[PDB]
Design a protein around this ligand. Structure first.
Ligand SMILES: *CCC(=O)Nc1cc(-c2c[nH]c3ncnc(Nc4ccc(OCc5ccccn5)c(Cl)c4)c23)ccc1OCCO
Length: 269
């Protein structure tokens, strides 16, 4: 369904400010100004670093998939511009990434917000699973905040993220929906610690020995045992014993209906 992806001319979008950068390239805030319309749409523009050598046709095939996602908790690719570089255009998410949001707001985040984010992320991942798409890089840095209670997963379809990876991904490069569930458990841990770094100060090459010994990320103080047990189930060595995203939607939706029962936040009780 080609109509879902706009092939953008260079005149149709303008990079105005920098949103962030790294080894991957640079993201800009700017405007999409479609020719023959009368509107200026706020967008993010991710310009990937120029590659020395896939051909346009293969890139467009993947971009068509990214433009085909239709779920309120998964970012959709709106347009692409292929030149010497690949530029990806999508709606601007004004509050930025969820990791930095929770760090910035760590004294002002309630239990219902936290649990709602867990529901929304599980819904987006369950959608990707229904589409037979494996994310491979779920993390709080790859959830974007459209408004404080509407978040969306980004950076699927595109430094190995060892500290978010299932053991079978580290050891055998196996990536499945169930290794995404492992990353989901780490992502929830990031939210419940208000953005702490997992395994802080531990070299990436030491993580597999931690997991092999049965050690895991610690129980966040605000988490009751019921919430931590979900997170621990996501880190089982047996991938098929981990929760499914459809079960995680159900369990976190139940907790979000009684948030004070399940998280004990600063000032509660
Ligand atoms: C947690 C740190 C961080 O990520 N900081 C950055 C935030 C943003 C950013 C801020 N507002 C945004 N709105 C919209 N998009 C982005 N970023 C963004 C991420 C991915 C992609 O393309 C990939 C993709 C598109 C569609 C579907 C699936 N994948 C785009 Cl186009 C835009 C926003 C930007 C950069 C940040 O820093 C990066 C380095 O830390």
């Amino acid at each position: 369904n080609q109509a879902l992806l706009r092939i953008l001319k260079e005149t149709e979008f303008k990079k105005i400010k920098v949103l962030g950068s790294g080894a991957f390239g640079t993201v800009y805030k700017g405007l999409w100004i479609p020719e023959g319309e009368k509107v200026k749409i706020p967008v993010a523009i991710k310009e990937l670093r120029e590659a020395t050598s896939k051909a346009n046709k293969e890139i467009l095939d993947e971009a068509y998939v990214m433009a085909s996602v239709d779920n309120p908790h998964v970012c959709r690719l709106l347009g692409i511009c292929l030149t010497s570089t690949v530029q990806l255009i999508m709606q601007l998410m004004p509050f930025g990434c969820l990791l930095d949001y929770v760090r910035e707001h760590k004294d002002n985040i309630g239990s219902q917000y936290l649990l709602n984010w867990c529901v929304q992320i599980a819904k987006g991942m369950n959608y990707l699973e229904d589409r037979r798409l494996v994310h491979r890089d779920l993390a709080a840095r790859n959830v974007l905040v459209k408004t404080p209670q509407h978040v969306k997963i980004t950076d699927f379809g595109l430094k190995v993220p060892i500290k978010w990876m299932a053991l079978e991904s580290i050891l055998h490069r196996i990536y499945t929906h169930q290794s995404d569930v492992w990353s989901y458990g780490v992502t929830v841990w990031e939210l419940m610690t208000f953005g702490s770094k997992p395994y802080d100060g531990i070299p990436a090459s030491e993580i597999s020995s931690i997991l092999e010994k049965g050690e895991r990320l610690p129980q966040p103080p605000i988490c009751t045992i019921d919430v931590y047990m979900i997170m621990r189930k996501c880190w089982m060595i047996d991938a098929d014993s981990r929760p499914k995203f459809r079960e995680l939607i159900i369990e976190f939706s139940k907790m979000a209906r009684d948030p004070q029962r399940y998280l004990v936040i600063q000032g509660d009780e």
